[PDB]
Design a protein around this nucleic acid. Structure first.
Lengths: 84, 60, 130, 153, 102, 210
RNA sequence: AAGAACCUUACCAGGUCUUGACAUCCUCUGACAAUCCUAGAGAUAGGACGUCCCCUUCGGGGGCAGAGUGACAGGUGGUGCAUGGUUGUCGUCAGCUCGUGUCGUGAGAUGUUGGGUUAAGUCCCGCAACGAGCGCAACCCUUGAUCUUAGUUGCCAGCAUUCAGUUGGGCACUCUAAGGUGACUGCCGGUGACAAACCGGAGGAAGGUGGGGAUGACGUCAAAUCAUCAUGCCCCUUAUGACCUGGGCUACACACGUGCUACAAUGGACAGAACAAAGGGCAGCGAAACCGCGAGGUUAAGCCAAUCCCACAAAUCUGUUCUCAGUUCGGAUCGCAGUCUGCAACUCGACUGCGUGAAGCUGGAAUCGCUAGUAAUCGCGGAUCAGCAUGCCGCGGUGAAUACGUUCC
């Protein structure tokens, strides 16, 4: 990125804000993987829309600046014939 | 789907970056020079038709 | 408006020069700089100065030349053809020995325009059967 | 077809002779007359420094010493190749001489290219070195097998 | 002694139209006027364009169509208002880039 | 090629562009309006016919002169038709208009007209060979130094494909002073479309000087 | 493919629509259109703030929306073994043909063969043939020499001015673009039928189709493109169509084609000095000044441009330094920290600073290009383009080796 600053679409902002202030709801899908993780966002688990299937993702304290959608690879491995 | 494409283009894009160039004479996108907004083939056929001066062809 | 002097334009491969054969010590002047200085060292500069030496030898006339365009060797060659044609305009009689010298004409040649499908205006990058 | 006209080289101011300009043509790499110029004058200087003698003389003797008298030419008229020895054209003589000269000079391995061109040209002066050895090898491939190229072809 | 002077400039793709326009635009300058500088040449800038021949592949074959752009200048020391009123009418040519400035 | 269009070569040295002007802040927009004018003249090509329209523009002005074998088709009775066309074009161009008219002598000599005519004959399902023969005879009546003509695509509906051509007199496209008119047309038979081409050698042009 | 982050994009997945995203006819009301809120990933739906305009004695005129309706619209759906159109290929190789006539039972042949000559079916001579058409050539453009016309924003020699052609002046010259001049074997000599033509020499800026480009003949390959456009036929239609979010077009054990960078002392690194051409620029180029090591930023003059800007030419030269090694060789890969563009740089952008320092010390079998300003190599610009050019198209710098010859491919 650059400066001022990391950019969530902003709906995730109010969502995680309301989820932080109250309710403590867990597991929620999102199509907007472009959004970066935030300190207020910590500890939540989001189903990430790779396209084929949502992949749930827990948020450790260590991850912030990495993109939220980065953790789930759309790519399928490998695929190769004769292993070993 | 060229009618759907030109309909997609003539309508205002949600973001200004989206507006790719395309000629009016033909609905083909891609490989369209921006300065004249013509097809390479559009400009080809018009070149044999002759639309602008001048010489034409392969000078210098 | 001073003492009479001959001059001869001389170009090569898009590099034009304007020589002036004012009589004097014979020290050469290129762009207000000595030929020993403007293109060090460079031995080829003596080849720029050869035509005057090949003709009777020697005056020697002072040269005030202004050149523009091309590279160093090209503009220097322009100095050469330029002093050559100026020497041609010196006296008509000299031209006879000059036919033996060649050393005129400026043969027009310059790098060819690139052909489409070719990198070197002649060279083709590659070919491969199958 | 027929023979083609060939341009004469602009003479080198030092040492006057055009043949040295032919060296300026052959030794040159990446189209740089100036690099050939510097290596040429430094070559004359290093020749001037060790074992005093005129550079033009040792050079002339060297070039006379590096020109083959005969050369083979392979031709597959049948099973296996058959080289045919023949008297060499003098232009081809100086060409092969200068080319094997610069080529073997390139591989001398000395830290200074000028000093190894010096060692090489003096080896040509002394009837030794890789160049004279190679001309001798061409002399061996020739004469010994000239019988097929006696007056047949 | 120097003073600002009107200096009309012409530009066109075709040249015959351009110098015919030059003759027409200086001819009005000659009548009811004075001095009248000639149409001095300008370097002219062409625009090359390489385009593929085939509808599909065969990129190795192409063609170069290009568009040159000529330019010219004309001057007159005497503003002479009558030929300026005469200047307002110009039947020819449809294809010309006249530009007036003082 | 195998055959580059002569029309792409004749222009400049021996012929003028169909539409000349200058640009300009908006080189594209003039071309857009002019191509649109071609789009509506093409609608006028449906029966009134036209060999060609010449176009000139000079800032808030236009000179879309027409030349046609049948001048009265576009004028109408009392000249009302050319006026209504003038309004129909004025409504579109957004600028002042005054469309002009011209009547070509010996109109069959023009390539565009004979090509459109033989194409209509192909629409009439007359034999293509006899039609090309009548073409050569008619252009022979027109009087010309040399004429060539060609047709392609399905011919009579026979076979998967066929192409034919007939000619008489010199037709030197490689000549740079030949002043050869070129034309193409596109017939629409139920069996399929028919390609149409014709070359007309009007004769060499001699340059003048004063 | 002259720019796949979204779009493009067609394909996948999910969420939505069925006279429709796009065009026309009908009836039919009504201006059309927008300002925000709410829910949603968007797509859109639910509300209010809002439109309610223009010419007509009342029928109307006009774009345009909405409603319904049959029609239709739509397909980058299939078919280049249905095509138009356009383009490769032998090949810029010199051939391919026709009219008339003759000959042959006929198919066919003659002309187009033969002699000389040419890059050429080029020319010449002869020939039962004489012509002609499409090509080659010529005609065009570009480059080079020179004249004339015309001298600013360009030009600076002769004069003064200044940091500066910058400013007086000059309008010579360079330079610029119009009209001319010039090359045609023509002049001489020799050969040849005294023909064509070749060779040699002179004249000449350029000599024997001057150099380069354009110019691609009949046709071959059912060659390529239904996907540029057009469209015969066939198929689909609350879906082979339309909208949207995200993906993918960039996969990864590997093979191949084609480029780039190197494997180094003719070199690397540092410092100083010096010579270009052409092209682009107003939704732009953006100087100068300033901030940051850098990338860039702040700010802003000038320029619709022979004025100003992009912009500094690089190799090279001159010295200093390393002294032959996986190296002060090369830069890979990756880490960290920044930066430009964009709603937005995870997939899948570019650039910079710092750090990390693969492989490679010239490459088997095999194979490619090029006869001179060509090969060799160094930088620059442009089309493309929000951003992204080792690709492509051009520009100039430096600038060779060899061509005995048609034995062989």
């Amino acid at each position: 990125s650059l400066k001022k600053g990391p950019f969530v679409d902003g709906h995730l902002m109010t969502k995680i804000e309301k989820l932080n202030e109250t309710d403590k709801k867990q597991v929620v899908k999102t199509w907007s993987r472009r959004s970066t993780i935030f300190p207020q966002f910590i500890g939540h688990t989001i189903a990430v829309y790779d396209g084929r299937k949502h992949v749930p993702v827990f948020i450790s304290e260590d991850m912030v600046g990495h993109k939220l959608g980065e953790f789930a690879p759309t790519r399928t491995y490998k695929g190769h014939a004769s292993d070993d | 789907a060229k009618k759907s494409m030109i309909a997609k283009q003539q309508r205002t894009p949600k973001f200004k970056v989206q507006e790719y160039t395309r000629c009016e004479r033909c609905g083909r996108p891609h490989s369209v020079i921006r300065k004249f907004k013509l097809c390479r083939i559009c400009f080809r056929e018009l070149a044999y038709k002759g639309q602008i001066p001048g010489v034409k062809k392969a000078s210098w | 408006m001073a003492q009479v002097q001959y001059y001869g334009t001389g170009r090569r491969k898009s590099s034009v020069a304007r020589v002036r054969l004012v009589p004097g010590e014979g020290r050469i002047v290129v762009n207000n700089r000595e030929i020993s200085e403007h293109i060090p060292s460079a031995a080829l500069i003596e080849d720029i100065k050869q035509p005057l030496t090949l003709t009777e030898t020697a005056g020697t006339y002072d040269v005030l030349v202004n050149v523009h365009g091309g590279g160093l060797s090209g503009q220097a060659g322009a100095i050469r053809h330029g002093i050559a044609r100026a020497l041609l305009e010196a006296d008509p009689e000299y031209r006879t020995t000059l036919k033996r010298a060649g050393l005129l004409t400026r043969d027009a040649r310059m790098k060819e325009r690139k052909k489409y499908g070719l990198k070197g205006a002649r060279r083709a990058p590659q070919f491969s059967k199958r | 077809k027929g023979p083609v006209a060939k341009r004469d080289v602009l003479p080198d101011p030092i040492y006057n002779s055009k043949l040295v300009s032919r060296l300026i043509n052959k030794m040159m790499i990446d189209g740089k007359k100036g690099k050939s110029q510097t290596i040429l004058y430094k070559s004359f200087d290093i020749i001037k420094e060790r074992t005093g003698n005129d550079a033009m003389e040792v050079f002339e003797q060297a070039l006379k010493n590096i020109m083959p008298v005969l050369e083979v030419k392979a031709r597959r008229v049948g099973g296996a190749n058959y080289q045919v020895p023949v008297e060499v054209r003098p232009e081809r003589r100086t060409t092969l001489g200068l080319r094997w000269l610069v080529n073997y000079a390139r591989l001398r391995g000395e830290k200074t290219m000028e000093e190894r061109l010096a060692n090489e040209i003096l080896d040509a002066a002394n009837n030794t070195g890789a160049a004279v050895k190679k001309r001798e090898d061409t002399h061996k491939m020739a004469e010994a097998n000239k019988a097929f190229a006696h007056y047949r072809w | 002694m120097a003073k600002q002077k009107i200096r009309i400039r012409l530009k066109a793709y075709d040249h015959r139209i351009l110098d015919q326009s030059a003759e027409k635009i200086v001819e009005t300058a000659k009548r009811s006027g004075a001095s009248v500088s000639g149409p001095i040449p300008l370097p002219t800038e062409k625009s090359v364009y390489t385009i593929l021949r085939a509808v599909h592949k065969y990129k190795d074959s192409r063609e170069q169509f290009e568009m040159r752009t000529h330019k010219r200048l004309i001057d007159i020391v005497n503003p002479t208002p009558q030929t300026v009123d005469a200047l307002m009418r110009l039947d020819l040519p449809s294809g010309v880039d006249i530009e007036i400035k003082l | 090629g195998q055959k580059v269009n002569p029309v792409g070569l004749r222009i400049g040295v021996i012929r003028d562009w169909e539409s000349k002007w200058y640009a300009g802040k908006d080189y594209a927009d003039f071309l857009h309006e002019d191509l649109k004018i071609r789009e509506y003249i093409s609608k006028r090509l449906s029966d009134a016919s036209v060999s060609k329209v010449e176009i000139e523009r000079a800032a808030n002005r236009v000179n879309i002169t027409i030349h046609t074998a049948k001048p009265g088709m576009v004028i109408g009775k009392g000249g009302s038709e050319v006026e209504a066309l003038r309004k129909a074009l004025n409504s579109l161009t957004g600028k002042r208009v005054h469309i002009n008219i011209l009547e070509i002598k010996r109109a069959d000599l023009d390539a565009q007209l004979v090509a459109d005519n033989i194409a209509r004959q192909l629409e009439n399902r007359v034999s293509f060979r006899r039609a090309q023969k009548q073409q050569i005879q008619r252009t022979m009546r027109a009087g010309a130094q040399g004429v060539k003509t060609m047709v392609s695509g399905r011919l009579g509906g026979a076979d998967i494909a066929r192409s034919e051509y007939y000619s008489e007199g010199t037709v030197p496209l490689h000549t740079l002073r030949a002043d050869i008119d070129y034309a193409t047309s596109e017939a629409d038979t139920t069996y399929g479309k028919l390609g149409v081409k014709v070359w007309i050698y009007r004769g060499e042009v001699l340059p003048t000087k004063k």
